[PDB]
Amino acid sequence: VMLPDGTSAYTRDGSFQVDQNGQLVTAGGFQVQPAITIPANALSITIGRDGV
């Protein structure tokens, strides 16, 4: 997780949402380090057994 100050923290709780810009964040406004962005007009989101 990319902290606002600049460093990175680590979490075990998986409950993700989407911020106003469309990028995947955790509950609390913090965004994941790889910066996954969900595009608009998205019918469904799937996450495989691996990280894809």
Partner: protein, 99 residues
Amino acid sequence: YSNEQEQVLGQIVLANFANNEGLASQGDNVWAATQASGVALLGTAGSGNFGKLTNGALEASNVDLSKELVNMIVAQRNYQSNAQTIKTQDQILNTLVNL
């Protein structure tokens, strides 16, 4: 109209928010746009990411009682277990005070 003619007065506009769960509930069953929700992003009801309307129908409550009852049981047990801690702390403090 009786003259076998059809007159259109407009169309209902839908809205797809950039992200839900950021809308703030306002009393009755309405939502207010705010931060973490983006602009309304209005559009027609036919195409885009908007769903298809169905005339003469309504949505249900999407609430299942079976889940709620067991969740209430678990929550009550957790509350009682928490109150046990307060009771034990009070007893410890009383024993310390009495000496």
